[PDB]
Amino acid sequence: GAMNSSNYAELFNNDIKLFVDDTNVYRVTVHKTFEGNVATKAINGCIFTLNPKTGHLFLKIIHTSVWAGQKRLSQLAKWKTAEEVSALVRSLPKEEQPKQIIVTRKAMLDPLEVHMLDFPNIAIRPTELRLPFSAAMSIDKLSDVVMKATEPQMVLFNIYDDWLDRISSYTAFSRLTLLLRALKTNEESAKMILLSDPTITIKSYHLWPSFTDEQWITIESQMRDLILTEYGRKYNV
């Protein structure tokens, strides 16, 4: 069934599972036309498919050509997502295929269930967690590869960098969701925090800066401050 605060450690057991987030699949800019009407222009998007135990991210880039000549694009986007997740599963060796797929939005359940009929033993699950994966396009290297794509493309990343050498999956996921929640609540501030000290760099093969253990504690504290703040700035408290 649904994934929530009560069965949270299930994410870090040894049953392969993937989160699928479709927020950034269909992206548009809204603009005025010469006649003064409104129109949309699609921009490249991506499916965010993440193994929360290992950090492996299957970033399927959705090029704007997939929408050409199609109607009802927000509905199509959910089915395109399910098509691409199903194709990813079929592409993996049997022993790497997930036992569960957790969708971050309930509207993905029927599209994914229908595309996965061939896999009756893979459980498709919703979640009650409000996960911040929409903020993935605030990660500069992810945004860059999506915007530069000229054709459909899958790009593989480890969203934890090398953190698992020093910390557990549970802790790594908690750091990731704290970072993304901050980026979602106040992107400018969050990004200032992450880069303020130019002596800490991002390795070419990494997404995040090379903080020491002690610097991650300070970073993490600054992100909590931002989130609580913004929460005040918002509701006035």
Binding site: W79, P111, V114
Partner: protein, 300 residues
């Protein structure tokens, strides 16, 4: 006009014959039902006064044999049986008719209700849904489960309705996932009509039989089947015009006949609102939409 005589009535029971019903008291001198119209299937059904649990009954067609009812004190129910001795049966019935111990099937001449509810229902198809080949009539009751209910437990006592499942490989062509799920025309027309039912008459017959079992016995799996067969048509963008026109008539008479007080349990809010207001056929069921809005506007 045919007759289903009753050996006796040893326990107090409400007896139904099609859409009619009457109360019989314990050991009342009741000996059956006469003037039953030839040309239709019929159902004779029972609810004991002491145990309203288990409505049960028998689907039959008097053209197929001479059937009678007898009370079995061991199994505790009124059983339908077939009399092979046609002379014994003519003799038994005439005797009952002369002593005026039979109720008359009370059809008003103007009234086409039963025809309209059973237009496509055939006894030979009933006997494939309800498997008991040694009898020419078919027993149904409130508790019997359907084949599909059993997949999700005694198979001899099941309702073998055609399995309909919108999230199944049978319903969804590889490579047409979105198309077939949002427009079920290929499942309706190719899989079900051309493949399984062979024609729309057999499809409507099963739909009508499922409704009648839901209504007369409160059979939950029959209600599920009825709604699934409605939803499969309404969720298809491409349906023959004659099928839509006939479906409107079928459903109109079903909604008209439904007891006003049973709408809460026999009508699925989601299906009816989808079918009348969202589906491809939202504008194709004028008679059904009008009676639903005037009789059950709460559900909608």
């Amino acid at each position: 006009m045919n007759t289903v005589p009753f050996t006796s009535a040893p326990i107090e029971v409400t007896i139904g014959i099609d859409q009619y019903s009457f109360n019989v008291k314990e050991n009342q001198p009741f000996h059956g039902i006469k003037d039953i119209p030839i040309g239709h299937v019929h159902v004779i059904h029972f609810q004991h006064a002491d145990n309203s649990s288990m409505r049960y009954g028998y689907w039959f067609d008097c053209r197929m044999g001479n059937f009678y009812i007898q009370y079995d004190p061991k199994d505790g129910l009124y059983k339908m049986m077939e009399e092979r001795d046609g002379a014994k049966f003519e003799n038994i019935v005439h005797n009952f008719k002369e002593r005026q111990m039979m109720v008359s099937y009370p059809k008003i001449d103007e009234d086409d209700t039963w025809y309209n509810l059973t237009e496509f229902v055939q006894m030979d198809k009933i006997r494939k849904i309800v498997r008991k080949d040694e009898n020419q009539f078919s027993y149904v009751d409130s508790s019997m489960t359907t084949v599909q209910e059993n997949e999700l437990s005694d198979p001899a006592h099941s309702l073998n309705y055609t399995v309909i499942n919108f999230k199944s490989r049978e319903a969804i062509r590889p490579g047409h996932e979105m198309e077939d799920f949002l427009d079920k025309s290929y499942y309706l027309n190719t899989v079900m009509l051309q493949g399984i039912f062979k024609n729309s008459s057999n499809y409507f017959g099963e739909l009508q039989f499922a409704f009648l079992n839901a209504m007369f016995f409160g059979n939950y799996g029959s209600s599920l089947q009825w709604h699934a067969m409605i939803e499969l048509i309404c969720s298809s963008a491409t349906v023959p015009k004659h099928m839509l026109d006939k479906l409107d008539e079928i459903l109109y008479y079903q909604i008209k006949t439904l007891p006003e007080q049973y709408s809460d349990i026999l009508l699925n809010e989601r299906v009816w609102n989808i079918c009348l207001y969202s589906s491809f056929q939202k504008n194709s069921l004028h008679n059904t939409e009008k009676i639903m809005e005037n009789k059950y506007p709460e559900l909608l």
